[PDB]
Amino acid sequence: MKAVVPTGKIYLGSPFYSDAQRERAAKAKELLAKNPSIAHVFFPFDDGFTDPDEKNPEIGGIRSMVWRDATYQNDLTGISNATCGVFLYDMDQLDDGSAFEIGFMRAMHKPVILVPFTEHPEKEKKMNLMIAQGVTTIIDGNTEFEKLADYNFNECPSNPVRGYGIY
Amino acid sequence: MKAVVPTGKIYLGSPFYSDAQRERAAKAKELLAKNPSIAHVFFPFDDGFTDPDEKNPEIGGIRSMVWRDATYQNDLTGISNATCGVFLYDMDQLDDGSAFEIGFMRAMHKPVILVPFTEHPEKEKKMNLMIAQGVTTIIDGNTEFEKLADYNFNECPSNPVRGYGIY
Amino acid sequence: MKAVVPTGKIYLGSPFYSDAQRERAAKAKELLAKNPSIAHVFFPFDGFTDPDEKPEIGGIRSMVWRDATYQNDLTGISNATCGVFLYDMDQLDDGSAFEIGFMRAMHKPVILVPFTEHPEKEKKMNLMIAQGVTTIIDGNTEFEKLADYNFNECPSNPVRGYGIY
Amino acid sequence: MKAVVPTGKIYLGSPFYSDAQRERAAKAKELLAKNPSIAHVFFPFDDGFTDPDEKNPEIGGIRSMVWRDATYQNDLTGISNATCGVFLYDMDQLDDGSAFEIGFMRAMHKPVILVPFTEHPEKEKKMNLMIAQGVTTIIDGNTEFEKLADYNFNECPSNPVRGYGIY
Amino acid sequence: MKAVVPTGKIYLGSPFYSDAQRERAAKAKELLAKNPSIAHVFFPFDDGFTDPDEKNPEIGGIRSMVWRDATYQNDLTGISNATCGVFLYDMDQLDDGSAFEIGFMRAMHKPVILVPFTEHPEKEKKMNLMIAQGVTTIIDGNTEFEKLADYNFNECPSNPVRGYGIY
Amino acid sequence: MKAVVPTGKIYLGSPFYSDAQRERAAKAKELLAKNPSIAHVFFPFDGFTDPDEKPEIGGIRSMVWRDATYQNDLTGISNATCGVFLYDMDQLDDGSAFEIGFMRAMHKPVILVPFTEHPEKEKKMNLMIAQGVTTIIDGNTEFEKLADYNFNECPSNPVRGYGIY
Numbered sequence: 001m002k003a004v005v006p007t008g009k010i011y012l013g014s015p016f017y018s019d020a021q022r023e024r025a026a027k028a029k030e031l032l033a034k035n036p037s038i039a040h041v042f043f044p045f046d047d048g049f050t051d052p053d054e055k056n057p058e059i060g061g062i063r064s065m066v067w068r069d070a071t072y073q074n075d076l077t078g079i080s081n082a083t084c085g086v087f088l089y090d091m092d093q094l095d096d097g098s099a100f101e102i103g104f105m106r107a108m109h110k111p112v113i114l115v116p117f118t119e120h121p122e123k124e125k126k127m128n129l130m131i132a133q134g135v136t137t138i139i140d141g142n143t144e145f146e147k148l149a150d151y152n153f154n155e156c157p158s159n160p161v162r163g164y165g166i167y
Numbered sequence: 168m169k170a171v172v173p174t175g176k177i178y179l180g181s182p183f184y185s186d187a188q189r190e191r192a193a194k195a196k197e198l199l200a201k202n203p204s205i206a207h208v209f210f211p212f213d214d215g216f217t218d219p220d221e222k223n224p225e226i227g228g229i230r231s232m233v234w235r236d237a238t239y240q241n242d243l244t245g246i247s248n249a250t251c252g253v254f255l256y257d258m259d260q261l262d263d264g265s266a267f268e269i270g271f272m273r274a275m276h277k278p279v280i281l282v283p284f285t286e287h288p289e290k291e292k293k294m295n296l297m298i299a300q301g302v303t304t305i306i307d308g309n310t311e312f313e314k315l316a317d318y319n320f321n322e323c324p325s326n327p328v329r330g331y332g333i334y
Numbered sequence: 335m336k337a338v339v340p341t342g343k344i345y346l347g348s349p350f351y352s353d354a355q356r357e358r359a360a361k362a363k364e365l366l367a368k369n370p371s372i373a374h375v376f377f378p379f380d381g382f383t384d385p386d387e388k389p390e391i392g393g394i395r396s397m398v399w400r401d402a403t404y405q406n407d408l409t410g411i412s413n414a415t416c417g418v419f420l421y422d423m424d425q426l427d428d429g430s431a432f433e434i435g436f437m438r439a440m441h442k443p444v445i446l447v448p449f450t451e452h453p454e455k456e457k458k459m460n461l462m463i464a465q466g467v468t469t470i471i472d473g474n475t476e477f478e479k480l481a482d483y484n485f486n487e488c489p490s491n492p493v494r495g496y497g498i499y
Numbered sequence: 500m501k502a503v504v505p506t507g508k509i510y511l512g513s514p515f516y517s518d519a520q521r522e523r524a525a526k527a528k529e530l531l532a533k534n535p536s537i538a539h540v541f542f543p544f545d546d547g548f549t550d551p552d553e554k555n556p557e558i559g560g561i562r563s564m565v566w567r568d569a570t571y572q573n574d575l576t577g578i579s580n581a582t583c584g585v586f587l588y589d590m591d592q593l594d595d596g597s598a599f600e601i602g603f604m605r606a607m608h609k610p611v612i613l614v615p616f617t618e619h620p621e622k623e624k625k626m627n628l629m630i631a632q633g634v635t636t637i638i639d640g641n642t643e644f645e646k647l648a649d650y651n652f653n654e655c656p657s658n659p660v661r662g663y664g665i666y
Numbered sequence: 667m668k669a670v671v672p673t674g675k676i677y678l679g680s681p682f683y684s685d686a687q688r689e690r691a692a693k694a695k696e697l698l699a700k701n702p703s704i705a706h707v708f709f710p711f712d713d714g715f716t717d718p719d720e721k722n723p724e725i726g727g728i729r730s731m732v733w734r735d736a737t738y739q740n741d742l743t744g745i746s747n748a749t750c751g752v753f754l755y756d757m758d759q760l761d762d763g764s765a766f767e768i769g770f771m772r773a774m775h776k777p778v779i780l781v782p783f784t785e786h787p788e789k790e791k792k793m794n795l796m797i798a799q800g801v802t803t804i805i806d807g808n809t810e811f812e813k814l815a816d817y818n819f820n821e822c823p824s825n826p827v828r829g830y831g832i833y
Numbered sequence: 834m835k836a837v838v839p840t841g842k843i844y845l846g847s848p849f850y851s852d853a854q855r856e857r858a859a860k861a862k863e864l865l866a867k868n869p870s871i872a873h874v875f876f877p878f879d880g881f882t883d884p885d886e887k888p889e890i891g892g893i894r895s896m897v898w899r900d901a902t903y904q905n906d907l908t909g910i911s912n913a914t915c916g917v918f919l920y921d922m923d924q925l926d927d928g929s930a931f932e933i934g935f936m937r938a939m940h941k942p943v944i945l946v947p948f949t950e951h952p953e954k955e956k957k958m959n960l961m962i963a964q965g966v967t968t969i970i971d972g973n974t975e976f977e978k979l980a981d982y983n984f985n986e987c988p989s990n991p992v993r994g995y996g997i998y
């Protein structure tokens with residue numbers, strides 16, 4: 001029933017390797033900001049750990065084990081504190097980090113909101129069984145991105161993936 | 168220390184959408200068969216559930232919810248009974264089902280053996296942080312596929328991913 | 335130990351088959367509604383609609399509806415910080431029991447609120463329930479405690495006075 | 500794949516006390532003892548903890564906290580060690596202990612096999628959604644009780660509950 | 667991102683009995699009470715369970731099973747409700763209770779903040795690997811105790827233990 | 834209940850700093866070696882080598898070595914069906930305690946095998962240890978029980994006779 005205070009703690013998982021992916025993340029935060037059921041949102045790429053012993057760090061480059069552990073754990077920490085996951089899932093370039101986080105969250109029995117995006121709304125609709133069955137709620141990013149602003153994250157109502165070929 | 172009987176229960180995760188992926192799986196089973204530390208190996212694509220109410224089933228096609236649940240659960244069942252995971256991980260075509268299973272297994276604190284394969288041993292070596300940090304042991308598929316036959320699955324000795332750019 | 339804000343997130347599980355059971359549920363919602371340590375309450379029966387289900391209650395239900403409804407409850411269990419169970423000692427609801435075992439396997443606290451209309455029978459309880467529950471509040475004589483119980487910390491209160499089977 | 504040594508570790512859950520129920524349990528053991536895939540079977544009612552500090556143990560009595568604690572724990576230990584659960588489920592007199600155990604195992608992602616028994620096959624077939632959905636494989640006690648001797652507990656293939664009204 | 671309402675639910679673990687230790691705990695509370703990101707703080711020694719059936723409660727005595735059970739459980743409940751753990755860790759007299767609690771929380775994937783205190787800053791700096799690796803963020807009690815008032819418990823950014831010998 | 838094959842998978846945790854501690858560990862391995870209910874035993878100190886570490890015991894260790902070694906233990910905890918702890922009551926090993934809490938959060942059984950060289954002091958134990966452990970075998974007077982204990986089912990034996998703090 002109606003909550004006394006916002007309780008949703010969103011773990012916003014998302015690729016961040018292209019302008020389009022980056023714009024979706026931006027857009028997602030905005031909508032989430034308009035949702036009255038949200039108490040907090042964590043985006044893994046917002047802050048960052050800095051390793052002093054790490055001289056001249058580069059992206060996609062070799063990183064120190066210390067930076068790697070700290071950054072990975074901040075993400076797991078985000079998942080731990082989150083009550084649910086929201087994944088801006090690029091269906092054109094499958095992100096394994098996101099897929100990994102979806103499985104982790106489900107192993108913890110946490111609800112997972114999948115928001116698929118494709119630049120080819122007209123190509124075949126197929127999805128991996130693990131993703132298709134692991135997620136508890138699907139919200140198409142192409143045509144319903146906006147309900148993130150209204151979805152009741154206090155209870156995360158289920159909505160099984162349907163309409164996708166399974167492989 | 169030395170085990171009285173084999174105790175390793177391997178969950179062999181792997182894409183199965185190309186001849187090359189299919190040959191690796193085949194090869195993997197053979198090596199695993201030669202390993203004295205293995206009590207059992209589960210390959211998700213070996214058996215299969217059959218839904219009677221499912222008329223004319225097709226691969227990649229729309230599947231019944233009953234078949235979807237049963238098949239997904241057989242996989243989770245495999246992960247549950249497994250003591251460790253071994254992933255024939257295609258680095259050229261990232262498989263999200265596999266990535267999902269890697270995260271699930273790690274959320275359960277189970278050791279995960281990553282065996283990466285690439286048809287371009289000469290291209291840049293980069294890996295997602297979640298995969299790079301989530302796996303506990305890496306065995307290159309291109310140059311060490313064969314140690315699967317000797318690895319001590321009774322204890323799954325760690326071997327951190329190194330030599331890969333992190334993104 | 336004094337919360338800055340209410341944190342208690344209650345999963346209120348109970349059978350919803352008889353009028354009596356529907357009454358208890360009705361009362362609990364109100365009682366918990368007056369507790370200042372509660373941030374939110376979730377009640378399973380407050381549902382999903384399979385647009386493809388041509389559907390009777392108690393009848394054969396589509397797998398899609400079954401999956402979504404079952405998940406909505408587990409999701410309520412996941413979000414909850416504790417469980418409050420309007421537990422029927424006369425008609426044992428295995429669903430409620432399942433959920434109690436699920437929550438405990440998750441290490442979360444479970445407040446057992448038993449009810450009986452047969453005070454005549456020897457008060458007894460299954461071991462798993464007797465030992466699994468962390469806090470018991472008699473529904474026949476302490477129901478009102480739910481409006482005052484501190485769900486921010488859910489103080490323990492082991493089951494006693496019940497014969498074990 | 501074929502197991503090198505039996506892998507199934509069964510948690511055999513069942514109500515006792517009722518003459519019929521005891522019979523079921525006894526026959527289940529026999530059936531299981533004949534299954535090559537089973538490595539071990541734990542039945543909670545077999546042996547028990549004796550509280551030396553317990554005067555006159557009343558079976559159904561107001562038993563001491565030490566006995567209760569040790570007995571309850573001996574069951575969780577069995578659930579913990581078990582790879583799968585097999586429940587002799589009485590559809591005539593619902594045993595909440597069993598139900599408890601089923602959800603506990605499912606929260607652990609362990610496979611659960613339901614073997615329902617009814618002395619009233621003429622009565623309506625109904626099942627609580629939590630059981631019907633939580634269970635991973637059903638094997639009708641009244642009709643396929645014998646299957647327990649052939650079921651491959653090394654993989655516990657799933658068989659979704661069906662044909663039951665759901666309330 | 668910025669939280670809409672305090673999200674941090676702290677499990678404040680610490681040894682008691684020792685005059686110094688009590689002081690630490692008292693100051694930690696003050697510091698925490700000043701942190702805007704904190705929603706609630708649970709300290710195991712604050713209030714307690716009273717076993718009406720317990721004659722003359724001996725603090726350090728052979729306490730009854732009911733008291734023990736209710737007290738131990740009240741702590742797990744706090745760990746369960748908590749989003750993160752903050753441990754006032756005595757490097758001079760290792761408290762195994764605290765250690766227990768740290769591993770329990772890590773098995774749950776919850777973030778753990780170590781605040782080490784030593785009355786002998788001249789002695790060698792060493793730490794048991796399990797603590798040094800299990801801990802997700804360290805905040806020197808002797809030097810940065812005040813940080814507890816600024817630390818964003820809505821996300822618990824990590825800070826790997828370093829500068830300690832490991833045995 | 835009679836295993837077809839040994840299933841017990843033991844995670845043997847203990848401090849490995851003093852000669853005495855190194856002796857107990859030595860004995861346990863042998864005792865467990867005679868138990869027919871055991872399929873395998875894992876002992877943390879039996880290690881990893883960071884080819885890039887130029888390394889002293891107790892010294893500063895590379896993060897890579899730290900990560901791999903720590904993981905090897907958690908992996909041993911994951912594979913194990915139960916834990917056997919050669920627990921020192923004179924010099925509390927927080928590593929062992931951490932691992933005990935980890936295993937219990939995983940619902941696995943933990944056999945506490947305490948040892949003391951000071952029978953003179955009031956036998957006491959921390960609550961979390963006293964309540965977390967599921968089976969206790971006195972290392973000073975029952976050490977040998979480990980060769981006969983049934984690890985296929987690890988029968989419970991709550992801690993008693995210890996004052997609680």
Ligand SMILES: Brc1ncnc2nc[nH]c12
Binds near residue numbers: 075296297334
């Ligand atoms: Br992936 C990935 N890469 C780099 N920084 C990160 N933080 C969180 N997830 C990250």
Ligand SMILES: Brc1ncnc2nc[nH]c12
Binds near residue numbers: 128166167211238242
């Ligand atoms: Br993916 C995927 N697709 C089809 N069948 C499967 N079984 C296990 N995993 C599977």
Ligand SMILES: Brc1ncnc2nc[nH]c12
Binds near residue numbers: 379381403407629665
């Ligand atoms: Br149980 C159970 N049975 C039927 N419908 C439900 N909705 C929520 N929980 C339910």
Ligand SMILES: Brc1ncnc2nc[nH]c12
Binds near residue numbers: 461462499570596
């Ligand atoms: Br007695 C006894 N022994 C083992 N498991 C049980 N569940 C309920 N009562 C039980």
Ligand SMILES: Brc1ncnc2nc[nH]c12
Binds near residue numbers: 737741763960961998
């Ligand atoms: Br007393 C008491 N109360 C709460 N937590 C504790 N840990 C050890 N002893 C404790």
Ligand SMILES: Brc1ncnc2nc[nH]c12
Binds near residue numbers: 795928
């Ligand atoms: Br603890 C601990 N400390 C140092 N080395 C180890 N290897 C295994 N467990 C260890």
